[PDB]
Amino acid sequence: MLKVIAQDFIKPEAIDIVLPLYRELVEKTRQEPLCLAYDLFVDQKDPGHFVFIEEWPDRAALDIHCATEHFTRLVPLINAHQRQDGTVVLMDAVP
């Protein structure tokens, strides 16, 4: 499987705007046939620092995720309010 961590840094002013967007993103993503796990967290010291922890079967299933209606609609609406670029790490389990 493919494990992903993605981090967004949202302007503090914008947190209340983006929360509903994140909630829909999580709900719709979890309904993707190929999504194994998808959970969203927030940094205890930065209420605007959001972290996705995701598990996909492979890269192809992640490409599908990236092309979905909900991803392509919701993510730029979220990123409109970023304080800095986000980061994404793609990973393998350490055996």
Residue 13: CB minimum distance to a copy of itself, A: 18
Stretch that binds a copy of itself, among 27-35, 60-68, 74-82, 83-91 (CB under 8 A): 83-91
> In angstroms, rounded to a whole number, what is the distance separating the alpha carbons of residues 80 and 16?
14
Burial of 39 (C-beta count, 10 Å sphere; 0-12/13-18/19+): exposed
Q: Choose the stretch contacting a copy of itself; rule: CB under 8 A; options: 28-36, 39-47, 68-76, 78-86.
A: 39-47
Q: Which residue, 41 or 72, is less far from a copy of itself as judged by CB? A: 41
Q: Do the Cβ atoms of 85 and 25 come closer than 8 Å?
A: no
